[PDB]
Every structure is written in C-alpha cells, then in structure tokens.
Design a protein around this nucleic acid. Structure first.
Ligand code: MG
Ligand code: MG
Ligand code: MG
Ligand code: MG
Ligand code: MG
Ligand code: MG
Ligand code: MG
Ligand code: MG
Ligand code: MG
Ligand code: MG
Ligand code: MG
Lengths: 73, 101, 119, 88
RNA sequence: GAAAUGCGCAGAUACCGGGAGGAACGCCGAUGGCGAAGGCAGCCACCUGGUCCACCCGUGACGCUGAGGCGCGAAAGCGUGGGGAGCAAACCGGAUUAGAUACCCGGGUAGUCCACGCCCUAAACGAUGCGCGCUAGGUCUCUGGGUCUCCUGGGGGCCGAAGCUAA
C-alpha cells in the first residue's frame, strides 16, 4: 500500500541535469527543504542520484533552499 | 579545450553603469584566460531561496565556453576577485539527461 | 505599556525546563518566563505543568504591554513543548501560526558523549 | 591526459605493418606512454599512493612483454629499447 | 533518579542583528556504490588509478602463483612546526556508595585538525590466500549490451539441486 502522489508522474518530460529549473526542482523538495526519498519521487536509482546532485547545485546558486520550516505543529 | 558553463551571480542592486563595467571585466577576464564564448544568456535577477550577501535577490549570468582545462580554476579565481561578483560556479558541460519523456 | 498588539512567542522546549520568550514583530523580547520563574526548582521545571504555568505567565505578562496576537515558534523536543502551545492558545492571545524551527546541524560538532552513543 | 590522436601518433609510429594495433612493440610503446605520464604525475603528487599501485602494474606488465620479445627476436628487443629509451 | 559543584545583577539563560574561527558534512542514503587491503560521502575544477559492456580489429601462450625484496597499511602513539570551535585520557571538582581511585554531573591538558617525518599494530573479520575449470534452480537488486515480454554480460543479497560439514 501507501501509494499516493508519486512525483515522477505529476510532471512532464523534464531534464534532470538542469540546476536552474527552480519550478520543476522545488517539486522534489519536501515541505521543509529536504530532498525527497525515492519512495516519494518514484525515480529510478540512477535518476535519484542525478537529481540529488542537481538540487545541490541549485542550492549553491540560491535558487533552492537548504532548509525550511514546518507550519502546523 | 573542454566545454564549460560559467555561472555568475551579481549584486542585484547596481545600476546600468556598474553592471556594464562588471560584464566588461568579466568578458575581459575570460579573454585573458582562453575563453572562446559560445552561447550566453543574461537571465537577469531572481528571488534567492536564501539571502546571499544580505540581499534577498541576485542578478544572474551564464556563459557556455570552450576553454583550456588547465586554466579553469584561475578563470574562476580571477572572477571572484570582484565585489559585486557574489558567486561563481563553473561546471563542465554535459549532454542533458531526460526523464519522464 | 509600550504597546505592540502582535508579535512572536518562542517556546524553547527541553528535557530539563521549558522557557517562553515574547517579542515584538522584529524579535526583540517584550517579556519572558520559565519553569524556574514560576517557582519550580529541580526536575519539576521540565514537567508539562511547568510549561503550562510558564507559558501562561509570559502571556499575562505580555498582555499588559497590550499584546493581542502571536506567531508561535516551537524550538526543542522537550516534555510539555505542546502543553506550552495549548496554554498559549487558551490565553487570550491569537495564535496566528505555529512553526517548528528546532535547530539541527548538517552533521557539525562532535556531540557530548551523553548524546551520541550507538552512532 | 592522452588524447586519441596523441595515442594514434604512437600506434602508427610503432606498428609492424599498417593496421597493426596489437603487437608487442605497439604495447610496450603505449605503456611507456602511460608510465612516463604517471611518473610525471607522481613527482608532483607524491602522496597519491593509490595511483602509484597503477604504476607498479604497468611496469610489471612492460618488463613482462619485454621479457617475451627478448626471448623471441632479440633483434626487435634491442630495437624497441633503443627506440623507446629504456633498460639503461 | 534526586541533586550539588558550575554559570548569572561586572545582567546570564531565552530572542533579533553583525563578526571571528575551528571542525564536520543533514536530507539524498541503502537492502546502494568504489577500492588489494586499511578504507572512501557538501560542492566545483584540475591531475590520476582500477573496472565493465559491445565490435570480434591486432599480437600469438606473451600464462598462474610467488620464499626473500619493496611499497601500502584504521585508531592510538612519536618528532618538528602550526592550529585549537566542539569533544575529551590524565587531572580538578560535585554527587553516588559500605567504600567508589568508577559508572552520573560541572570543569579540563595532551589528543583529536593541518604539513612534513616516524611508528606497522588490530575482532587489520567473510575470523574463509590467489587463480582456472566443472556441477539444478527461484528471487530482490546495482551497472552495460540486444531483436528490450524477455535475451545476454559484470557486481551485490536471499532461499535452495547435487554434493559437503562434528554440527
Ligand atoms: Mg581477431
Ligand atoms: Mg597470425
Ligand atoms: Mg598507521
Ligand atoms: Mg592518528
Ligand atoms: Mg603530534
Ligand atoms: Mg566538556
Ligand atoms: Mg566529564
Ligand atoms: Mg549474478
Ligand atoms: Mg545478475
Ligand atoms: Mg541435502
Ligand atoms: Mg542437528
């Protein structure tokens, strides 16, 4: 079970090495700033590896956050 | 000669005259280091996900260059020497890798 | 009586004590309170009753300066971290948000031995 | 590094005949290309001990093909060395 | 556990802003990967080793193993510089206890970090030397190739044929 929204589906034909595409990348960050698990991006093992490096370049450029803050508690 | 990509974040707060001066020093810095400049795109300024240099924005640049490998670290060194150059990121270029396509 | 109306409440929750600071919309404190402030002494301070009393004291203390609404900022994983929030809500302060901002290194400083053990 | 056409100028420099990609002469040459590069590298990076193992194997490989070529046509052997500048 | 040393009106704890510095890299991240081992984890560039697949192009047994030799070798430790955030042998205190040279608590030097040079050890563990050939399968997986359901490689797991084992 446990199969809600898998992020690969809810997106189109995107490039994974593109570190400037904030609006596509930020879909793989959590509500906090965290890189999401595979069981939640629904990527392949090799796919996740690349997104993982791409997201980090995006953070260095200030386009994606390193961390954020939970708004309910 | 390898093909790179030079990212430069810029002081979002300077005007036409201090910008046009920076871009000058940037393309002269390139010239002196072997940078043959293929395609470029001044995407401008966007909202940073986190304040850099206490600004909440940053003016962006991007060059795709062929240049001597042995000279890249100095090129990036020289580029960071400036004060409105907040970040330099020099990646070597890659064939894109589609997904979900 | 410097008049502020709205501002931030910081809950600093810990295992040994809870401690609540109230600030203006810029973060400069207006007033504060804690388990020791409400006359507890030892281990009683980290109890969730202490966090109730402490939170309520720092609210009453703040409604004098005329507070009405508050953004809450939890920070810590103590006992009565949450009994502190419940008190803030039932208190005559608008709780407009609760945000957890507990600080956490990106693996940074070698912890005390108490705090690392089985890795 | 060493580029394709860099390499090429060595295979054609040593082939016993056109299209000879893999004769003892060609191999013992190609290695000496890699060995001198590595040793040049390790004169700077004296602490790259991992790469150094590479060198120990290239060398072990060279003097093994050399040891064969000398047992087969001691002509071509004393010939390869004078051309490459080894054993001395 | 409860506490007390300890810090605080020379204004601490909690909170916002600015700065310095040392060390380590959260998520990704594991059932994953690399490496001969020891070991290897933010990001970028440069220098450099190993490896795998397809083509079936070249050489023509050039192979395997390897006493000595040589190099590598976690942590602690040594020398000379440097550095020193946090941590912490020794040590100084507070507790606990019948005692408590200890577990708990407040401090703290070497050390941990860097460079160079030594040391050469270990539950240096798969407690399983290296290479090659042969002997059912099922299944999860990392990484190639193909006519891509499936086929065929290379690696990491699990269960099991034959067989082996004192178990
Ligand atoms: Mg053939
Ligand atoms: Mg023949
Ligand atoms: Mg050692
Ligand atoms: Mg050591
Ligand atoms: Mg020392
Ligand atoms: Mg300490
Ligand atoms: Mg201690
Ligand atoms: Mg297999
Ligand atoms: Mg397999
Ligand atoms: Mg049986
Ligand atoms: Mg039995």
């Amino acid at each position: 079970p446990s199969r809600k929204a898998k992020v690969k589906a809810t997106l189109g034909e995107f490039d994974l090495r593109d570190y400037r595409n904030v609006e596509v990348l930020k879909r793989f960050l959590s509500e906090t700033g965290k890189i999401l698990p595979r069981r939640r991006t629904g990527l392949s093992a090799k796919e996740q590896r690349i997104l993982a490096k791409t997201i980090k370049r995006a953070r260095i450029l200030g386009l994606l956050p390193f961390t954020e803050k939970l708004v309910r508690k | 000669m390898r093909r790179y990509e030079v990212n430069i974040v810029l002081n979002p707060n300077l005007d036409q005259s201090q910008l046009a001066l920076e871009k000058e020093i940037i393309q002269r810095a390139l010239e002196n280091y072997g940078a043959r400049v293929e395609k470029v795109e001044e995407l401008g300024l966007r909202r940073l996900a986190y304040p850099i240099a206490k600004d909440p924005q940053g003016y962006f640049l991007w060059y795709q260059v062929e240049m001597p490998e042995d000279r890249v670290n100095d090129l990036a060194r020289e580029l960071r020497i400036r004060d409105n150059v907040r970040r330099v990121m020099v990646v070597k270029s890659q064939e894109p890798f589609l997904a979900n396509a | 009586k410097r008049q502020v109306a709205s501002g931030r409440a910081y809950i600093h929750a810990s295992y040994n004590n809870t401690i609540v600071t109230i600030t203006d919309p810029d973060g400069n404190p207006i007033t504060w309170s804690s388990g020791g402030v409400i006359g507890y002494k030892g281990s009683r301070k980290g109890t969730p009753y202490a966090a109730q009393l402490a939170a309520l004291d720092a609210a009453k203390k703040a409604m004098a300066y005329g507070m009405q609404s508050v953004d809450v900022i939890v920070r810590g994983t103590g006992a009565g971290r949450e009994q502190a929030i419940r008190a803030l809500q039932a208190s005559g302060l608008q709780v407009k948000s609760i945000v957890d901002d507990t600080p956490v290194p990106h693996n940074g400083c070698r912890p005390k031995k108490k705090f690392r053990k089985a890795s | 590094p060493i580029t394709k056409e860099e390499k090429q100028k060595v295979i054609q420099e040593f082939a016993r005949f056109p299209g000879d990609t893999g004769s003892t002469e060609v191999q013992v040459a190609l290695l000496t290309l890699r060995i001198n590069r590595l040793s040049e590298h390790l004169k700077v990076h004296k602490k790259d001990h991992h790469s150094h193992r590479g060198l120990l194997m290239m060398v072990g490989q060279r003097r093994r093909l050399l040891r064969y070529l000398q047992r087969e046509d001691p002509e071509r052997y004393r010939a390869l060395i004078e051309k490459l500048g080894i054993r001395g």
